Design a protein around this nucleic acid. Sequence first.
DNA 1: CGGCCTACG
DNA 2: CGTA
DNA 3: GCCG
Length: 326
Amino acid sequence: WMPAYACQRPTPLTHHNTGLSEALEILAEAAGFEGSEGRLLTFCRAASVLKALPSPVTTLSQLQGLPHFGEHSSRVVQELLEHGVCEEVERVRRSERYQTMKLFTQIFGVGVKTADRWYREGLRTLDDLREQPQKLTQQQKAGLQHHQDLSTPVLRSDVDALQQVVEEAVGQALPGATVTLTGGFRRGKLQGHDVDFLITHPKEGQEAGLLPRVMCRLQDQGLILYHQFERSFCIFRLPQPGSWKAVRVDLVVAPVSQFPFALLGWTGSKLFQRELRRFSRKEKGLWLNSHGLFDPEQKTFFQAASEEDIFRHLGLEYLPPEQRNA
DNA sequence: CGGCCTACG
DNA sequence: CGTA
DNA sequence: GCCG
Ligand SMILES: [Mg+2]
Ligand code: NA
Ligand code: NA
């Protein structure tokens, strides 16, 4: 009944099993912290299956036959249903290791391997890192410097303000170039922790060299706190009433021939994308990324005019962005 | 048993 | 490695 | 951890 890949089923933003999915996502995150990307993936997939169900799970019976539910994920749901809490999940939550790895990996520039090294070295707090600045890359120094602002939810009003200044810079850099909001806000989220924009031009090739010109124009308006091509992972100085706040912004340039692939890629969700690329390769024999869809036997790229074209070619029912919240 | 998205900076 |  |  329930399809096995997240790209085969609609997943709305608001769903009926948040308590269960959040618990499984804690186990997925913890699996990542210990270096098991396979267990992370299963727990993420199991959580995503629950987000796609039409009703609350109230009895263990309702898991029977669901993809990515085995002994472990089922036991977690069982305990939550029976007792309101899962002992394993609570143990993880309260553990010094989980809490510190979560604290460190939330920093822009810090992933699991870096965080794990710092944990093994005895570091535990943001202050501890500030005390040892030579342990930090320039990217990490920026992530730590702006950490409080970057932990503040980005709102739609912020997105609209950012879109206007990005459109202004892009128009100054290249007449006719366009700016498309992607990421979580395109999927309908009302908040986020960053903002993603996709930039192109209707005439193939005109966009060459565009992103450095856009960055210079934003920098000269004082809008850039951190950056450093066709992808830029930035921190903007966003004006506020009487002041300013740092906001994470991703800027991406694509040639228009690639625009539907880049739009599909950068719209996410992250799990949706990896499930879609897995489906493409394992079920259809085609290789998908944010540039194209490649048939490795014919050695040809699919010409797509829209996201719908990409879904149809993969034999998938089209999902609008608001249903890609896997 | 081995696979688990696939790129760019 | 980091980012998505 | 789950699945092909
Ligand atoms: Mg982003
Ligand atoms: Na991080
Ligand atoms: Na985003």
